[PDB]
Each structure stands twice: as C-alpha cells, then as structure tokens.
Scaffold this active site. Structure first.
Site, mmCIF file in Angstrom:
data_model
loop_
_atom_site.group_PDB
_atom_site.id
_atom_site.type_symbol
_atom_site.label_atom_id
_atom_site.label_comp_id
_atom_site.label_asym_id
_atom_site.label_seq_id
_atom_site.Cartn_x
_atom_site.Cartn_y
_atom_site.Cartn_z
ATOM 1 N N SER A 84 10.398 2.246 9.000
ATOM 2 C CA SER A 84 11.122 1.958 7.766
ATOM 3 C C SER A 84 11.852 3.120 7.087
ATOM 4 O O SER A 84 13.003 2.964 6.674
ATOM 5 C CB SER A 84 10.184 1.282 6.765
ATOM 6 O OG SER A 84 9.081 2.115 6.459
ATOM 7 N N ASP A 95 4.900 5.100 3.090
ATOM 8 C CA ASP A 95 4.579 6.310 3.832
ATOM 9 C C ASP A 95 5.660 6.645 4.868
ATOM 10 O O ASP A 95 6.445 5.779 5.260
ATOM 11 C CB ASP A 95 3.219 6.159 4.524
ATOM 12 C CG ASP A 95 3.135 4.919 5.391
ATOM 13 O OD1 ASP A 95 4.185 4.286 5.650
ATOM 14 O OD2 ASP A 95 2.012 4.578 5.828
ATOM 15 N N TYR A 219 3.083 -11.189 5.974
ATOM 16 C CA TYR A 219 3.447 -9.835 6.349
ATOM 17 C C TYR A 219 2.188 -9.035 6.690
ATOM 18 O O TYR A 219 1.533 -8.459 5.810
ATOM 19 C CB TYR A 219 4.224 -9.176 5.206
ATOM 20 C CG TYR A 219 4.818 -7.834 5.560
ATOM 21 C CD1 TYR A 219 3.998 -6.732 5.814
ATOM 22 C CD2 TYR A 219 6.200 -7.661 5.660
ATOM 23 C CE1 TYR A 219 4.535 -5.489 6.166
ATOM 24 C CE2 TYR A 219 6.750 -6.419 6.013
ATOM 25 C CZ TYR A 219 5.905 -5.341 6.266
ATOM 26 O OH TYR A 219 6.412 -4.123 6.649
HETATM 27 N N1 LIG Z 1 4.830 -2.567 18.421
HETATM 28 C C1 LIG Z 1 5.508 -1.464 18.094
HETATM 29 N N2 LIG Z 1 6.536 -1.075 18.881
HETATM 30 C C2 LIG Z 1 7.230 0.021 18.537
HETATM 31 N N3 LIG Z 1 7.062 0.833 17.494
HETATM 32 C C3 LIG Z 1 6.028 0.422 16.738
HETATM 33 C C4 LIG Z 1 5.219 -0.679 16.963
HETATM 34 N N4 LIG Z 1 4.246 -0.783 15.977
HETATM 35 C C5 LIG Z 1 4.490 0.234 15.187
HETATM 36 N N5 LIG Z 1 5.565 0.995 15.579
HETATM 37 C C6 LIG Z 1 6.129 2.156 14.898
HETATM 38 O O1 LIG Z 1 5.102 2.742 14.120
HETATM 39 C C7 LIG Z 1 5.329 2.464 12.714
HETATM 40 C C8 LIG Z 1 4.033 1.997 12.107
HETATM 41 O O2 LIG Z 1 4.243 1.623 10.754
HETATM 42 P P1 LIG Z 1 4.344 0.091 10.343
HETATM 43 O O3 LIG Z 1 3.818 -0.014 8.959
HETATM 44 O O4 LIG Z 1 3.703 -0.695 11.419
HETATM 45 O O5 LIG Z 1 5.889 -0.289 10.317
HETATM 46 P P2 LIG Z 1 7.055 0.263 9.382
HETATM 47 O O6 LIG Z 1 8.119 -0.769 9.307
HETATM 48 O O7 LIG Z 1 7.403 1.635 9.828
HETATM 49 O O8 LIG Z 1 6.386 0.398 7.954
HETATM 50 P P3 LIG Z 1 6.437 -0.569 6.715
HETATM 51 O O9 LIG Z 1 5.289 -1.508 6.814
HETATM 52 O O10 LIG Z 1 7.812 -1.109 6.650
HETATM 53 O O11 LIG Z 1 6.223 0.294 5.481
HETATM 54 C C9 LIG Z 1 6.431 1.413 12.684
HETATM 55 C C10 LIG Z 1 7.237 1.744 13.929
HETATM 56 O O12 LIG Z 1 8.131 2.810 13.717
HETATM 57 MG MG LIG Z 2 5.266 2.899 8.068
#
Ligand SMILES: Nc1ncnc2c1ncn2[C@@H]1O[C@H](COP(=O)(O)OP(=O)(O)OP(=O)(O)O)C[C@H]1O
Ligand SMILES: [Mg+2]
Length: 470
Positions: A84, A95, A219
């Site tokens: 994000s 974060d 979510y």
């Molecule tokens: N299945 C996946 N495939 C690829 N990258 C992943 C996967 N799961 C998580 N990630 C990476 O690790 C990060 C973990 O944070 P997460 O909270 O899951 O998502 P995010 O969208 O970055 O955060 P927000 O929840 O939007 O604040 C998100 C993404 O950049």
């Molecule tokens: Mg995150």
C-alpha cells in the site's frame, strides 16, 4: 494494451463523470483515507534516513571483507518499498513495508546482527524486535512513530546499481528460498504498477474499494477474505478493462464486473511465462491440488501464486453477495438517486443474521491478551471449516473486526476482547467444544500458552446479541 483480453470499453469520461469523481474524493476525506501532505513528507524524509543507514551498513561490511577500495566505493545498497505505501494508497496510521537489497558479500546473518544493532542505537528507533525465523524473515521497528517491517535479500550481484529493477527473473537464479520469498512483495507491487493503464486512476479507485471492503466486514486475508494485495489486483484487472475511465466509473465497473464473475475462473493480470527454475507455481493443469481453489486471484510475478487460498465456501458467498449490493448502490449514484456516502455505510452486522456465535478470549495481562488474541484469530478458520461441514449450516460470517468485551468481574479489571460470527441455517455445542479444545491444545503444544489464557465460544440468537456487547 494491458491484460490477457481486450478491454471491454475504451470510452473516456464525460464532464458528468468528472464532477462525480470529485464528489467521491470529497466523500472519502472524512474517513482518513487520504494521509496528510505534511505526514507524507515526514515518511519520505524517514525513508531517506533509512536508505542511507543501509548504505552506511553495507559499506562497513565491504570494508571488513577487505574488498578492493573500488568495490567499496561502488557496492551501493538500497531500500525498496512495496505494498500500500508504495502503491500510493496507504491511509493514516498505516505501516510501511520495505525490503533491504544488498550485494552478495552481505549475508542474512549480517542483517540480523550488524544491521540490527545499527538500528538499535538510532535515536528515532523504538520497539526494535526481530523475527529471523518467520516465513519471510523480518526486523520490525517504530521509526519516529512509524511502523516499518523490513525484509532482506542478498543478490548474486557484486554491486547494487541505483536503477536495479527487481522484476528481472534472472535475479532469482539459484538463491535461498528465504531470499526469493523476500523479493516477491516488491516484484508483485512493481508488476501491478506496470500492468494498469493509468496509475492515478488506479490509486483513487483502490482507495475507494479498500474503504468499502473494510466497512462491509470483508477485509482480512487471515480470516478467509481479501487482503490489500488481493484488492489491489482486482482493482488492477478492472482498470485494464476500462483504460480510459476515471474513479467514479471504475468503482462502479468494479462491482459490475466482479458481482458477475464466474468463480472459480482465476483472475489474472498477465500471461504467465514458463521459467526454468523449479518454484511452486499455481496451475490447475499440472497440479490437481490447485483445482479445489474457490476464488483464485493470481500473483503476476514468477512464481505466480493464488493470493486467496484461504477463501472458503462461506467467505466466497458473503463477498459475492456484497458485490451485488455494491453494484446496486453505485447504479443509483450514477443515476443521481444516491450519494457516494451510501456506498460506505456499514450495514449493521449484529442485525443482519438471525444467529451468531460469540468468541471470548482473555489473558491476565494486556501484554498477553494481545499475544493470545493473535493465536486465537489464526485458528478461527478452523471453526468455520467445521460449521461448514455441518449439514444444517449454509455459511458462517466471521466479522474480522474484534473488540473489547463486557466485564465478567465487577472487582478486578479485565483484558478481554471478543468476536461475533454470522450464521445462516438451511446443537452447535459439540462443534464449538471441538474448536475450543483444539485452540487450547494447539496453543499449548506450540508453547504459546499461559495459565489463565481463556477462550470460550457460545451460540446466541439475534435479539440476545445486543446484550453481551457494548
Ligand atoms: N500473497 C501475496 N503476494 C504478494 N505479495 C504479498 C502477498 N501477501 C502480502 N504481500 C506483500 O506484503 C504486504 C503485507 O501487508 P498487507 O497488509 O498484507 O498488504 P498491504 O496492502 O501492503 O497493506 P494494507 O493492509 O493495505 O495496509 C502486502 C504486499 O506488498
Ligand atoms: Mg502493509
């Protein structure tokens, strides 16, 4: 163009959609969706400080390994961001996800020792906690109040060029899987940013969708729903199909498209090429196991994986129905018979089911409650799995939003949170006890349990819920 198929419509917006897109932006502001400019600047400067620390660290290692002064003067080093924040849709308080990329002479044990200590003596650092043994090894910290999770990867390169592009499949050539997993995040993000026709329009739309998903209680990857990445990919595929539309239209097409999607057909952002390496790749044609997946949304970088294999029958049902209502509301908004605000209204969860199961978890100390709730939440899918095999249940809707529960002792204070689960029928005491017994069990077996860490589940009827609540 972009995508594995031709777009559906190349139509651009009309001034009518432009002012409709402005009203969306306005409806979102009150929700904290947009981070403050002064704060974004704070985060930018913070990453610069970090990037330099990584540079500084690597140079020192380059000196202790006596490498020639030429290499030392050009080893480089770099901090990449993903998720994000890097997508440009991080909300207030979110974060930051970062990856530290170093040349070959810097081992992973160096990251957890030399680099870890360097962070340890910085005035801005707090809560420096490491987890060298996780699926994806990471050092977590709070830099000037900003939570930062830092992965680490060692590349087969002698130096790290500033314009290094992490999408080049060659970079994975014979590397520890730990390194490969740690690179996945940036690659997937960088891929998504390169698969949508208009990033600006992608960002605003993703913004709207994530708020909507959170507000509508769907979510959470952990609980079988969708997490940030999944939502970002669904939104990206929507953009690929309407390359010239803007946010007010895309949000609408999002629902139009997915409320009608024919699961389990997978959602792909690009054609998967075949690579020599032997890494796990989602593919129902070669792997029978991958054929049982219900709502597949595939990662665009090698090796591709289904980002949502935690989605069960219940969750899939919930989200499909939520897409329909979604389409309906946007339809009105587009006919000016409703306001964007209506899309972000949360239908009372505690009133949309005639039955519920309430999870109570507690520990003797605030420190422990937090740890306990951690373990418990990871197991909630187990109960849903059970409730599903039951012939009398259609679906169990766990509300991914837990919270502090009522007192069970007027004297001493309590550290007790709770969950509320939605039920739909076509007694439950046996399934609930297996769950409870299993939670207490697995927790204790894995040495993550302490006396007085309680967990109780109970069936309740709608009317009775409002009691055991505020
Ligand atoms: N299945 C996946 N495939 C690829 N990258 C992943 C996967 N799961 C998580 N990630 C990476 O690790 C990060 C973990 O944070 P997460 O909270 O899951 O998502 P995010 O969208 O970055 O955060 P927000 O929840 O939007 O604040 C998100 C993404 O950049
Ligand atoms: Mg995150």
């Amino acid at each position: 163009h972009y995508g594995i198929t031709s777009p559906i419509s190349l139509a651009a917006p009309k001034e009518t959609d432009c002012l409709l897109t402005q009203k969306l932006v306005e409806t979102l502001k009150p929700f904290g969706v947009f981070e403050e400019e002064e704060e974004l600047q704070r985060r930018i400067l913070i990453l610069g400080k970090l990037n330099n620390l990584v540079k500084e660290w690597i140079r020192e290692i380059s000196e202790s390994k006596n490498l020639p002064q030429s290499v030392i003067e050009n080893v480089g080093g770099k901090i990449f961001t993903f998720g994000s924040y890097r997508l440009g849709v991080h909300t207030k308080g979110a974060d930051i996800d970062a990856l530290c990329v170093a040349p070959r002479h810097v081992d992973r044990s160096d990251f957890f020792t030399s680099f870890y200590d360097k962070l340890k003596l910085q005035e801005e650092v707090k809560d420096l906690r490491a987890v060298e043994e996780a699926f994806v090894p990471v050092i977590k910290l709070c830099f000037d109040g900003i939570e930062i999770d830092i992965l680490f990867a060692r590349l087969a390169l002698q130096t790290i060029p500033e314009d290094l592009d992490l999408r080049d499949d060659s970079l994975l050539k014979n590397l520890d899987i730990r390194c490969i997993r740690s690179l996945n995040g940036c690659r997937v993000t960088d891929e998504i940013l390169h698969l949508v026709p208009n990033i600006d329009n992608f960002r605003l739309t993703l913004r709207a969708i994530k708020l909507w998903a959170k507000r509508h209680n769907i979510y959470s990857n952990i609980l079988g729903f969708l997490g940030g990445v999944s939502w970002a990919m669904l939104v990206a595929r929507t953009c690929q199909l309407y390359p010239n539309a803007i946010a007010s239209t895309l949000v609408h097409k999002f629902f139009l498209v997915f409320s009608k999607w024919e699961w389990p057909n997978p959602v792909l952002l690009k054609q998967p090429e075949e690579c020599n390496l032997n890494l796990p790749v989602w593919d129902p044609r070669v792997n029978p196991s991958d054929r049982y997946h219900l709502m597949p949304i595939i990662t665009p970088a090698y090796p591709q994986q289904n980002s949502t294999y935690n989605v069960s029958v219940s969750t899939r049902m919930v989200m499909v129905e939520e897409f329909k209502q979604g389409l309906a509301i946007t339809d009105e908004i587009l006919l000016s018979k409703a306001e964007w605000s209506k899309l972000f209204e949360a239908p009372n969860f505690f009133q949309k089911y005639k039955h519920y199961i309430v999870l109570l978890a507690s520990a003797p100390t605030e420190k422990q409650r937090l740890e306990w709730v951690g373990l418990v939440e990871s197991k909630i899918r187990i109960l849903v799995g059970s409730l599903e095999k039951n012939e009398f249940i259609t679906l169990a809707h766990v509300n991914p939003q837990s919270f502090p529960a009522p007192k069970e002792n007027p004297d001493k204070e309590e550290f007790r949170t709770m969950w509320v689960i939605g039920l739909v029928f076509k007694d439950l005491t046996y399934d609930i006890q297996s769950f409870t017994d299993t939670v207490y069990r697995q927790a204790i077996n894995s040495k993550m349990f302490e006396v007085d860490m309680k967990i109780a589940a109970m069936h309740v009827k709608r009317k009775q819920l409002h009691q055991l609540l505020p």
